[PDB]
């Protein structure tokens, strides 16, 4: 999996790849890892799908009850704390890494990481899943504060694509969603329009010279293509 | 399993310093370089821990809530010594259920012009002293703070800062999972204050570190 | 299987026998423990296995049977009901927290008409049981390391119409064969007989 | 540890040693391995010291309640049973015990062995512990029913002594008690090294 | 453990142109006692005593190898080996067997016949020497021997006071040890004489 | 992660006809390190005649000390304000240790105090509570050499009454030797002398390395 | 164990503590951990004592033949290299860990050799169980072109950190100083743990211990 | 679950539930016990001779163990419950103590079962 | 460790961090992982230092012999094959990941990766060590063919620094060496002049708000800095 | 330890005895295996342990001694040399590829002057050995599970000046004690005596 969320001024963007895998074989190539928790709060799920589906469903059930009582839209910090507690109480029984992000009028766009073990950290961006370890340096090198909604969607799409081109365990579609004072905006990019893959990157077009012909020179030139 | 590295602390004439870096790791990955790891607990007291950051969050929450509630409902403001005692009981209890708090705490504070500093480990061991540490602090820092405190009559604030920084510099040099970015809290005059992050000056330019001398094959 | 037990049923009796030995590892503590426990006037049970499971088990049978006889004006229970009761308790313990009784049993009874209304077939019955709760009526049966030797002799020599005297001779020879061929020492046997007139010890069988 | 007991015409003898040995280091030479439960019953203790002392103290608390409730002394059969049933119920919980219980009630002298699994056996001669395998050697040569009290105390003393001489975890002082109709009587304590010089 | 299977303890102390070496007399198989008359000391020559503890088959075999090499040394070299060379030799043999050791731990005590200087060595089972100036010890009650000697030993002592120190040590330590005991044998060595003494102890 | 840590160090006590003397070292050890050179948790006063002394895991000795301190407060409330004697506390302590048979205190303890006749006594316990009353006792890291030395000097079984002062010197000597050779024992010793009058205390330095 | 080395303007200083232990007991308080390799090369040793002794001896013997053969002074690099080949072959079964220091025609040389056979030449090193504590004195106190006195004070202070904070190290500081022209051992350079309470003398009058039997032999 | 307090004191130290229980005993058929040298005789009155009643009548003297009998007066169904508890108790005792329960012991067990029913809420 | 080599027109650059570690504690902060095999062939060592020092020494011994026989400078492919074979024959007994790179007149600059298991692959760049997994995406996103020597040194220094800022097991100096028809050029950059670290990156200056004061509002603002 | 052996030395002899039993798991194959093997005219060895190690071992001793006697004009080897030879082979095997002989031995000899030049102390010697190569001269010794019982009786009753008749009585009682208290059945003992006139079987000891 590769999940991530990024804050921009006024909102957040959440992004994810679309693959569910048993290790070597893809059982679903079109999952939806961006799960809704309330009108403007979503989470990005990584780890066991069974666990993170059950904890998201449970977190959503609690928040809908709370919003009816209070009669108010719910703040991101509430979503994050409810989830966190579920992730902490069950830490030994699950495999889950979660990102909760959202928009609310009191604190704007916010992002919480809730990794394995059930800590909860409030950030400007968060990465998660197996594919995350390829993006730290990407973000360190290429990410900036101050990005608009449109810059941030585009940047997320390009990060996911970099991750999933090198991570065997990520791949497929790129889904995003942008949450802000206006209406939720979702987007799905098919693999055939991905902004990056190694298959289309010109520095990987020409093949390594692993198979030179039997020759009378130590000079290396081209791969042998036809029998002698 | 966001986890914090070394913490260190030292008493000087008039108060006590606690220091750590602002990093949470996950295994070898330096994941968050801008986390404030120190937590103010009540009026006089400050805590930090090495180990599992989730277990630190949970334990300080529980404590900060007892301390704030007790104060608000007429039972006065708990002191460092009391906070420390309550912490150690809860660490111990959890160990006794085989659900430990996988952290090692350092606690500091100042009440009645008397500075506190003590440690609690994950099976409930507790001790107070003039210098405490957790993590690679215990192996790397304590030999220096202890040498420093050998002087008779104790340390001034400034000499306590100098020796805190030398320890920081060695952690940065010899502790893998660290960064050059640190905060210091200072308990003194019955209140704690946390400084802005800072960096220490390091040395990398010795002739014995040059390419030719460290080459395995000439 | 350090303690051999033996039993067989003939037309008008059951002989039962069990080795006296009680041991602590390799040490012989004593060789005269009576393990052929009388349950009622016409029943015995020979149990094999450790003192503790063995005693607790047969004391629990005895007390529950005793309680069934006063809640029933002293009416004797049939052998096949005592066996069914024993079996349910071995089986129950096997799926319980505290786990199985590690005892192996031979239950021998002679059933005798309660009243005149009673249509019961009157005679001797032997039941083999195991610590799991297996239970099976049999004309002869054994437990312990001496079991195989004796089972084959009895397949060879046992008949239903042995006289009381011939069946003591045969019981004696089965005990000698156990002594001759089992390395664990089963040096002394106590042997009891169950008849129409009740339980009685057999002294010439040692 | 070594302990023995046996029944003869004048009653019962119990004898013990007093060493407590982890297996290498010797923690004590002064354990009291006979437990005066009350003034007509004795236990002995072999195996785990804490286990034997806690459960014989409990046994002694039940022998006393029995005697308050019923206005009479509990039998040796029942005493051994109370203790066999506690061990039986703890069978799966890792206790370590090898006890004798001895008394003289209305049916005469009775000696029982009772162990950590719930065994309970009545018999006329027993030895328990690591040195039991040497005590029985000497005790089987000398034992008979018609020993005098003096001859029987000598037999028991010589038996524990020979175990202390050859077993690594037995040693110390040898203590002999006599259970008679009137209750019991501590007969002797002799350091095993001083006994060495008596018997050479 | 295998080094404790057979039982036994040895101790050597230095004084002023003298030493004493002591051993217990017990041989065992874990807790079963086979003999009470097996002292563990071997006299190499007028100047050198060897103590061996550990597993008795390996004590027996390793002392026979030492004896064999010493005999050949004496014929080639036409002299007695000195305490320090004998120890270096012993060390070499233990380490020859570094990946499959002799389970012995030797205590060597010696005196330079000329200068009257005392050499003590103890070895681990792969021959690492520990050569202090006060005392050395080995075997099943070595922990309890350490503190007896730290509190009784003092520099300077002559043969008769060094003998009491060293006998009180061995006895009090064997008495808290189940695998060493049955009294002791002591050799007391000066440049001029070698005295041996059998000391009484407990019979457990 | 084990629930068990051994923090090291040593205690020792000696009784005589109207006093007992009790010593414990002040180092608290971690894993290949030293938390502090000035822990005083090993010795804990329970009444004016009775001490508990413990080694092993320090967090456990702090729990046991508190459970004893409240059983003792309860005795007083249920007994007309009186304190239990040393013999009673020793029996209480055995009882309590046994009760954790199944997850035990990692502690080697001593109850040390005056008896009812005014004389010293020491009860050494194992971790589940078997004990006896003795004239001397020791436990912890250095105890396997301090103990034969006390056997030697006090009983003199292989040879042919002490003051408070001579006894305090013997113990001082025994801790000094323990610190030289046992790497987990050191720094200082806290000594309490118990008489009917009261309790005198005295620190005493030891090797720092 | 705590062994330390530093390079200074004209040579090398090695340092060591002196306690050897078996288990948790001090077997020898004044053991010598600084070993001769050659006239101009010494070694301090940590790890398994037998292994550290065997390999140093062996390489010191082989360096001696090499000097008789060549008629030249041993090079520190030659030692380092014979050491590492030997430890590599045995895959860390021979578990020697060494600080090696010397001075030869190319100047001062100081290196560590770990038990699996890896080497590192560096201007300051520590090894052994008190290596961490020691190393914290060295990083706060090393500088370039230290004088002899400053080097000795830094090594001693680094060893004393081990002595007082690591339980497996103790007693006193030994230094060794190596220069183009001489090697100078300095046993007990620093003795920070002398006696305080002078020992109580306990006496046994001769004839305190009962003897069953005696024999005498005149030499 | 029903927990009401049934047996309570009233204004002069009277427990009426207990009194009225003893009234019920006074209406029940007469029973007698007589202790000889070495024999005990229990004798009870039966309701009334009928042609229809079964010749093998039900017994109103119960065995508690091989050596202990009981006869009663009062509510016959309550007594059958009481006799059950006592039969259990004797066998429990054999199992806990091997020996056979003493009469005097068994009497205190029964009597305490009656006493508890005068103080146990719900009953 | 973080090692890498990059081809440019005419030569290669090799780069490495300077840290040797036991896992948690740094035993050497100034190692030299760029090892010389012949005048213009070097390798970058990762894994067990004991193993890769012994295999490099052995490979160098063989190549010096071969150059005396032939009387010619040795080609990179020869270095790579000798090493590869040593890495393949001992694969079960070592932990080694190697990069051999070099310049020779016949084939110019060349780079071989020889990872664990002893394969040998001929590339335009190679990454290795624990810190490598942070640089795949860096290179995919930021690396180009056609770079000059000076661009390539600089790019390598910046890659190493990105790696070692996130990898606990890398750090210290950055050493490089540039190999081409001219003289070997080595460079060492001290940590105080590193072109990237998170400590100096302005998007990590302000601290996460993990420790807000006890307040009468759910609004989150700043970390509590002083006792109340 | 299923096979008990016993030996003790008195002023002018050694008695040796060993239990006849050969077993396959719990089954008694036979109870009359002689395990007291004569090595020469004045030596025997009682070995304990499996048939295979036991036979191979004592056959190797016998043949090497036989070879030493022709390469030496039939001169009898001393008991202490035979023991030293046995010990070196047990010890050697213990560090060999094929591993240890799992046999426990008692070697008994009576040494008798070769010639007139011979100054040898003439008399009986007993040596205890173990499968590891431990070896120790002793006045009595035993192996197997019956060993502890017998060792204590002999500590209690053995003296050096027993007559041949008293020492047979004592050997008999030690065999009875083994039968009485060891659970493994050692039912029949063969007992031989080593004297100045040689090895001879003792028939009254069973």
Numbering used by the authors:
A (entry chain V), I (entry chain H): 55 to 282
B (entry chain b): 1 to 218
C (entry chain Y), J (entry chain K): 1 to 206
D (entry chain Z): 111 to 310
E (entry chain J): 2 to 205
F (entry chain a): 33 to 192, 198 to 246
G (entry chain I): 67 to 285
H (entry chain R): 2 to 124
Manuscript text:
The proteasome is a multisubunit protease and a key component of the ubiquitin-proteasome system which is essential for the maintenance of intracellular protein homeostasis. The 20S core particle of the proteasome consists of 28 subunits organized into four rings of seven proteins each. The two identical outer α rings limit entry to the central proteolytic barrel made up of two identical adjoining β-rings. Three of the seven β subunits harbor protease activity, β1 (caspase-like, preferential cleavage after acidic amino acids), β2 (trypsin-like, preferential cleavage C terminal to positively charged amino acids) and β5 (chymotrypsin-like, preferential cleavage after hydrophobic amino acids) and are expressed as proenzymes with the active site threonine only released after full assembly of the core particle through an autocatalytic mechanism.
